[PDB]
Write a protein that binds this ligand. Structure first.
Ligand SMILES: *[C@@H]1O[C@H](CO)[C@@H](O[C@@H]2O[C@H](CO)[C@@H](O[C@@H]3O[C@H](CO[C@H]4O[C@H](CO)[C@@H](O)[C@H](O)[C@@H]4O)[C@@H](O)[C@H](O[C@H]4O[C@H](CO)[C@@H](O)[C@H](O)[C@@H]4O[C@H]4O[C@H](CO)[C@@H](O)[C@H](O)[C@@H]4O)[C@@H]3O)[C@H](O)[C@H]2NC(C)=O)[C@H](O)[C@H]1NC(C)=O
Ligand SMILES: *[C@@H]1O[C@H](CO)[C@@H](O[C@@H]2O[C@H](CO)[C@@H](O[C@@H]3O[C@H](CO[C@H]4O[C@H](CO)[C@@H](O)[C@H](O)[C@@H]4O)[C@@H](O)[C@H](O[C@H]4O[C@H](CO)[C@@H](O)[C@H](O)[C@@H]4O)[C@@H]3O)[C@H](O)[C@H]2NC(C)=O)[C@H](O)[C@H]1NC(C)=O
Ligand SMILES: *[C@@H]1O[C@H](CO)[C@@H](O[C@@H]2O[C@H](CO)[C@@H](O[C@@H]3O[C@H](CO)[C@@H](O)[C@H](O[C@H]4O[C@H](CO)[C@@H](O)[C@H](O)[C@@H]4O)[C@@H]3O)[C@H](O)[C@H]2NC(C)=O)[C@H](O)[C@H]1NC(C)=O
Ligand SMILES: *[C@@H]1O[C@H](CO)[C@@H](O[C@@H]2O[C@H](CO)[C@@H](O[C@@H]3O[C@H](CO)[C@@H](O)[C@H](O)[C@@H]3O)[C@H](O)[C@H]2NC(C)=O)[C@H](O)[C@H]1NC(C)=O
Ligand SMILES: *[C@@H]1O[C@H](CO)[C@@H](O[C@@H]2O[C@H](CO)[C@@H](O[C@@H]3O[C@H](CO)[C@@H](O)[C@H](O)[C@@H]3O)[C@H](O)[C@H]2NC(C)=O)[C@H](O)[C@H]1NC(C)=O
Ligand SMILES: *[C@@H]1O[C@H](CO)[C@@H](O[C@@H]2O[C@H](CO)[C@@H](O[C@@H]3O[C@H](CO)[C@@H](O)[C@H](O)[C@@H]3O)[C@H](O)[C@H]2NC(C)=O)[C@H](O)[C@H]1NC(C)=O
Ligand SMILES: *[C@@H]1O[C@H](CO)[C@@H](O[C@@H]2O[C@H](CO)[C@@H](O)[C@H](O)[C@H]2NC(C)=O)[C@H](O)[C@H]1NC(C)=O
Ligand SMILES: *[C@@H]1O[C@H](CO)[C@@H](O[C@@H]2O[C@H](CO)[C@@H](O)[C@H](O)[C@H]2NC(C)=O)[C@H](O)[C@H]1NC(C)=O
Ligand SMILES: *[C@@H]1O[C@H](CO)[C@@H](O[C@@H]2O[C@H](CO)[C@@H](O)[C@H](O)[C@H]2NC(C)=O)[C@H](O)[C@H]1NC(C)=O
Ligand SMILES: *[C@@H]1O[C@H](CO)[C@@H](O[C@@H]2O[C@H](CO)[C@@H](O)[C@H](O)[C@H]2NC(C)=O)[C@H](O)[C@H]1NC(C)=O
Ligand SMILES: *[C@@H]1O[C@H](CO)[C@@H](O[C@@H]2O[C@H](CO)[C@@H](O)[C@H](O)[C@H]2NC(C)=O)[C@H](O)[C@H]1NC(C)=O
Ligand SMILES: *[C@@H]1O[C@H](CO)[C@@H](O[C@@H]2O[C@H](CO)[C@@H](O)[C@H](O)[C@H]2NC(C)=O)[C@H](O)[C@H]1NC(C)=O
Ligand SMILES: *[C@@H]1O[C@H](CO)[C@@H](O[C@@H]2O[C@H](CO)[C@@H](O)[C@H](O)[C@H]2NC(C)=O)[C@H](O)[C@H]1NC(C)=O
Ligand SMILES: *[C@@H]1O[C@H](CO)[C@@H](O[C@@H]2O[C@H](CO)[C@@H](O)[C@H](O)[C@H]2NC(C)=O)[C@H](O)[C@H]1NC(C)=O
Ligand code: NAG
Ligand code: NAG
Ligand code: NAG
Ligand code: NAG
Ligand code: NAG
Ligand code: NAG
Ligand code: NAG
Lengths: 453, 129, 129, 129, 48
């Protein structure tokens, strides 16, 4: 009846911790590359048969809003964005005074010249003779300075480098894995708002294919929710906290760039070569995005029915568009076929729901010179090269990033407008069901057993 | 059966004492100039550090058997005041570590002492013959 | 004699069973910003991974002695159907592994089971006294 | 008492034979793109190489106990010609290694032989029963 | 003092044309050729 300690090695004992996770992508991701994959260069081939062990009787408490695999993912994506543009052609001897004009088109006076036919000098292979060459730019890329003479918008903010045309910006599935002694716990609950205990937890080594899609207002090609649509928020009462919505059924969206562009291959130096936008073959048309108004109808109805579970039952819920600010926040900023679209979402969030066959097209603008993520230091700016042909892409709308207004004690209704800016949310929409744990397999227990002498 | 890795994480300590050879199996191990190479390497060394941290303690203690073991250290009641059939049939390993986390370091001191003491003592029996 | 590293690689399993302490000796280990540093480092860690991969199996099996060992697993005839004096005096280790490569993983499962089973069983003998 | 790490470095071999579990405890383990990361990493791997270099020898010798041990190798007088009570009560470990540094490698050969020989010999006793 | 152990009774099958130590050597030499000329003086304001 006198007890003795007994050492045990291999006990299911873990503790919440943070380590350096690595990537994992299928063998096909390593296959589809002409140096075209922006990440897979050195990624571990995924296990052909992933294994997910259901841990019975286990109840673990998750917290999506203070989870670190998100911080690792985003800062890693930032660093990859950075590193992919270092050895690429730098457009420092650009920013020359541009003598620009409207594009060749006769339309009514209610059409501001989005595109500008610009002419300027350029340094040829030799550092002597210049080069009177012309290009075509979007109005967002340029700015007048005091015959209309312009400059590039970024000449007065940061340097600039062009994104090589060999690399691509195609979001591929990334499985995140943890090292030995650690594991990744995956909540298997159908209705889980990311914070609190999870009744049915399982464990895994590498998460499912999480595509790093960069958007701001609408989440794309994401993971659908199960059964009822999902609402997640750190503090619903605080109007400063975003409200991430994850969809149960995907909303079909179609974005197109109806301009058969041309690629001009200027020689700026003995090695470098710049890709300007030549003349347009066909009509002067605008990029646009389509949303089936029926599916969007039912989706908005299904989200408001979930909102009424949190803001009282007999209340009115209104939807308004963004308030203002940068273009990155006031438009559904994203990349599709390589061009960076910026769409007006005023036709989607202008509705009002009481207690109880066509497409909504959206005017989409395009920008080539973008400076997201600060620019890797205070210098680098990226020029998205011009893309030949008409680009058409079909995507899923799988979630939203909303924000509520601060009426305080204003009404029984409160209006909701799209938000974003902070893109870590884009990852919290898929890393809400995962968390890291270290294994400490040393456990001592008492038993009436002693080892003899 | 083989419930798999960490299968018996919500089970009683007596039921999880059967699956100690499984959690020990998957505890060690189941490229150009880049940033993922180091991303994997520093993790691939932390794996080894986290393994040998445990192994050196298991060695300097009386038991390099690496599975289960008994020791000549009296279970000091002040640590738990719980019963043999009330922990091995009514408590989970995590809960148990949650109770004993306070005294873990103390116990390690006592094990290291008892083991060095036993080995020094056994050399004297081996030297007289 | 000391035929050296891998001296008895073309010799019978009985004659190569004498040189097991030599191949185990040379199995672990016998600078500015550059590319050779990592060239040597990733190899210098693969050495350790390839060593401990073997050692963890040798530990979770009944034998941490690290030289030679017997086990309480019946040799299932279905594996070879060959004779004691027809392998230890008429076959080379490489040839032998060439025969048994198919079932190696199976055997490892049985060894892990037998060992965990033995240790659990010996704790019950130690606890009654 | 606990004199701490290397406390008995100036003490007689008999008095320092008490503090072998302390020096073994602190013998293994008690970040952006930079030069300190590798500065720490190559040191953090040299730690492991310097540990396992010793451990593989301790394993291929008869004693994986990792504390103290006796061996079936006769102490060849030609090595020291000193007395049991004149080294364990009148000489420091450093001084002692200073004497025996010449023959250390020789002794290692003899230990590896004796151990492989013992294990091969014990398999023959285990096989007849 | 390099050591070369002759493995008696051993017969191994070689294949020089699909051997990988060659690929490692060449790509390493390429990378060394590369890296040795990075910090060296660039003649961009030539070609006049
Ligand atoms: C949400 O999910 C949707 C659905 O997957 C996704 O849509 C994807 O859109 C992209 C962009 O348009 C599609 O990718 C392109 O597809 C076209 C043609 O489609 C296929 O055609 C042949 C067979 O007909 C297939 O073998 C081929 O692989 C395509 O799948 C291709 O023309 C594109 O390939 C070019 O670009 C790639 C990288 O950008 C290169 O790796 C490739 O070699 C091609 O390079 C050529 O392009 C230049 C002209 O563009 C040419 O001048 C060059 O010389 C060079 O030869 C590209 O694969 C994709 O198919 C759609 N999805 C799927 C599953 O196919 C959405 O994009 C996603 N959401 C977001 C935000 O992306
Ligand atoms: C964006 O802005 C740039 C500004 O440079 C425009 O580029 C020029 O556009 C004009 C027309 O708009 C082009 O001029 C055309 O050149 C053709 C080639 O003939 C010349 O070349 C041959 C050698 O190839 C010489 O031997 C020969 O002597 C010529 O000098 C002409 O055949 C065209 O003639 C037609 O148009 C003119 C217009 O006045 C008529 O008078 C003719 O009768 C005939 O109808 C024309 O002259 C010029 O070539 C373009 N530049 C370059 C470098 O090619 C872009 O067009 C503009 N883009 C858009 C979308 O607006
Ligand atoms: C080149 O650009 C010019 C613009 O500078 C463009 O000419 C414009 O054509 C439209 C025709 O659609 C003219 O608009 C008309 O305006 C009068 C009033 O001023 C209206 O009454 C007309 O009504 C018609 O359209 C209605 C709805 O569209 C119908 O309901 C109604 O029944 C009529 O059919 C009509 O809208 C416009 O005035 C001119 N602009 C100028 C400055 O004259 C021309 O078409 C372009 N050509 C090319 C080849 O690009
Ligand atoms: C846009 O969303 C639709 C969602 O319906 C996508 O098609 C659906 O894709 C999912 C996986 O992303 C499929 O689910 C999977 O099906 C397999 C079938 O064996 C199942 O075993 C898996 O567990 C998983 O549930 C689903 O079947 C598929 N729907 C249909 C009708 O085929 C579509 O790919 C999305 N487009 C994008 C992201 O571009
Ligand atoms: C491990 O040891 C620590 C002490 O080092 C234990 O912490 C102590 O826990 C008790 C509760 O069991 C704390 O009492 C608390 O008092 C506050 C004051 O009002 C009261 O609000 C709480 O409800 C609770 O009763 C005590 O303060 C705390 N000690 C210190 C210094 O904070 C801990 O419980 C031990 N762990 C286990 C698993 O037993
Ligand atoms: C390890 O197990 C595999 C099976 O999983 C064994 O492979 C089998 O080997 C036999 C020969 O011993 C193959 O038969 C072959 O049939 C073809 C068909 O004409 C014939 O041309 C060959 O000469 C030979 O007779 C059999 O196909 C093959 N099994 C499969 C699925 O391909 C293997 O032999 C085992 N290894 C050892 C060392 O025994
Ligand atoms: C760069 O382009 C401008 C026009 O876009 C050229 O400007 C000329 O500058 C000289 C300066 O002596 C003036 O005399 C001309 O009147 C300007 N306009 C012309 C020549 O059309 C400038 O020469 C170009 N740089 C070159 C060719 O190196
Ligand atoms: C860099 O350029 C941008 C755009 O040309 C400048 O932003 C504009 O600055 C002017 C004058 O300072 C204002 O009148 C505009 O309202 C600004 N635009 C916007 C959208 O706010 C910016 O100030 C420049 N930075 C410098 C010169 O340091
Ligand atoms: C997820 O849902 C649960 C259940 O609605 C929320 O739990 C609430 O937590 C607060 C404080 O944390 C308590 O005051 C409430 O009483 C809890 N609700 C219930 C019904 O008991 C939890 O806060 C939600 N988390 C998020 C991020 O939305
Ligand atoms: C967009 O413009 C390009 C201009 O090159 C078109 O490519 C040419 O198309 C014609 C007829 O379609 C072919 O005869 C040529 O051989 C094509 N050029 C080359 C280099 O192959 C392209 O077809 C246009 N876009 C579409 C959709 O037709
Ligand atoms: C979005 O695009 C897809 C494919 O481009 C559309 O689906 C097809 O559209 C064509 C032409 O509209 C039809 O002939 C097919 O029958 C459609 N097939 C399917 C499976 O739908 C889709 O309708 C578009 N939706 C929106 C809102 O633009
Ligand atoms: C959201 O919708 C409102 C109302 O339709 C838009 O407000 C108008 O914005 C334009 C552009 O600045 C102004 O010219 C109008 O005067 C505004 N109307 C009012 C009543 O203020 C707003 O622009 C839309 N949001 C976005 C981001 O486009
Ligand atoms: C986004 O959509 C809104 C709503 O259509 C746009 O606001 C319009 O602005 C034009 C001026 O160019 C006015 O003529 C319209 O009357 C406005 N609409 C309404 C409903 O008032 C807005 O300009 C669009 N784009 C941006 C960037 O806000
Ligand atoms: C929300 O969108 C509807 C749909 O366009 C807007 O309705 C328009 O209202 C104006 C009033 O100035 C009418 O002249 C238009 O004919 C209406 N359009 C349609 C298609 O019916 C509505 O204005 C928007 N919300 C707000 C607050 O303006
Ligand atoms: C461009 O077009 C607009 C409207 O058609 C006109 O007001 C403006 O003056 C034009 N500018 C140039 C440089 O042609
Ligand atoms: C959440 O919102 C409430 C609303 O009054 C506020 O009092 C609280 O400080 C906010 N933060 C929390 C609950 O962490
Ligand atoms: C579709 O959405 C509009 C926008 O408010 C709404 O008026 C209409 O009732 C919705 N359709 C259905 C069937 O509810
Ligand atoms: C609102 O009423 C419905 C029944 O119409 C009920 O099912 C639901 O629980 C209520 N939600 C509240 C009170 O938040
Ligand atoms: C163990 O329990 C005894 C009871 O006799 C108590 O005096 C002692 O302090 C405890 N030891 C430690 C190290 O906690
Ligand atoms: C071992 O041999 C027996 C013969 O009784 C056979 O039934 C069995 O399948 C074999 N076991 C395995 C795991 O191959
Ligand atoms: C050990 O001492 C003996 C004395 O009999 C001597 O002959 C022998 O050389 C010594 N051995 C070695 C290896 O030094």
């Amino acid at each position: 009846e006198n007890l003795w300690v007994t050492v045990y090695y291999g006990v299911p004992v873990w503790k919440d911790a943070e380590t350096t996770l690595f990537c994992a992508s299928d063998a096909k991701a390593y296959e589809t590359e002409k140096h075209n994959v922006w990440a897979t260069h050195a990624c571990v081939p995924t296990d052909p048969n992933p294994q997910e062990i259901h841990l019975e009787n286990v109840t673990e408490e998750f917290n999506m809003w203070k989870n670190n695999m998100v911080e690792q993912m985003h800062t890693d994506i930032i660093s990859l964005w950075c590193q992919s543009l270092k050895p690429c052609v730098k457009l420092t001897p650009l920013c020359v005074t541009l003598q620009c004009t409207n594009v060749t088109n006769n339309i009514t006076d209610d059409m501001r010249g989005e595109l500008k036919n610009c002419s300027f000098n350029m340094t040829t292979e030799l550092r002597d003779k210049k080069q009177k060459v012309y290009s075509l730019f979007y109005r967002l890329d340029v700015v007048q300075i005091n015959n209309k003479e312009y400059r590039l918008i970024n000449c007065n903010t940061s340097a600039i480098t062009q994104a090589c045309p060999k690399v691509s910006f195609e979001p591929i599935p990334i499985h995140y894995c943890a090292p030995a002694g650690f594991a990744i716990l995956k909540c298997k609950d159908k209705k889980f708002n990311g914070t609190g205990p999870c009744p049915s937890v399982s464990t895994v080594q590498c998460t499912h294919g999480i595509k790093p899609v960069v958007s701001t207002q609408l989440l794309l090609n994401g993971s659908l929710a199960e059964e009822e649509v999902m609402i997640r928020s750190e503090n619903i009462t605080n109007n400063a906290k975003n409200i991430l919505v994850q969809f149960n059924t995907p909303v079909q969206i179609n974005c197109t760039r109806p301009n058969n562009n041309t690629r001009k291959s200027i020689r700026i130096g003995p090695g470098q070569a710049f890709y300007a936008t030549g003349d347009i073959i066909g009509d002067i048309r605008q990029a646009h995005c389509n949303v089936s108004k029926a599916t969007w109808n039912e989706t908005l109805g299904k989200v408001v029915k979930q909102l009424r579970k949190h803001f009282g039952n007999n209340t009115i819920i209104r939807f308004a568009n963004s308030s203002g600010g940068d273009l990155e926040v006031t438009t559904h900023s994203f990349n599709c076929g390589g061009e960076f679209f910026y769409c007006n979402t005023s036709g989607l969030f202008n509705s009002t729901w009481i207690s109880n066959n066509d497409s909504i097209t959206l005017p989409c603008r395009i920008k080539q010179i973008i400076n997201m993520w600060q620019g890797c230091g205070i210098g680098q700016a990226m020029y998205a090269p011009p893309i030949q042909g008409v680009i058409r892409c079909v995507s899923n709308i799988t979630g939203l990033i909303l924000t509520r207004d601060g009426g305080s004690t204003n009404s029984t209704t409160e209006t909701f407008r799209p938000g974003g800016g902070d893109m870590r949310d884009n990852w919290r929409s898929e890393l809400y069901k995962y968390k890291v744990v270290k294994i400490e397999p040393l456990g001592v227990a008492p038993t009436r057993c002693k080892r003899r002498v | 059966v083989f419930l798999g890795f960490l299968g018996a994480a919500g089970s009683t300590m007596g039921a999880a004492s059967m699956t100690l050879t499984v959690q020990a199996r998957n505890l060690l191990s189941g490229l150009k100039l880049t940033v993922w190479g180091i991303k994997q390497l520093q993790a691939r060394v932390l794996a080894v550090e986290r393994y040998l941290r445990d192994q050196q303690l298991l060695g300097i203690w009386g038991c390099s058997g690496k599975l289960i073991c008994c020791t000549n250290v009296p279970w000091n009641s002040s640590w738990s005041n719980r019963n043999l059939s009330e922990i091995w049939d009514n408590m989970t390993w995590l809960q148990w570590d949650k109770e004993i986390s306070n005294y873990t370091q103390i116990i390690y001191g006592l094990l290291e002492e008892s083991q060095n003491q036993q080995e020094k003592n056994e050399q004297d029996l081996l030297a007289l013959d």
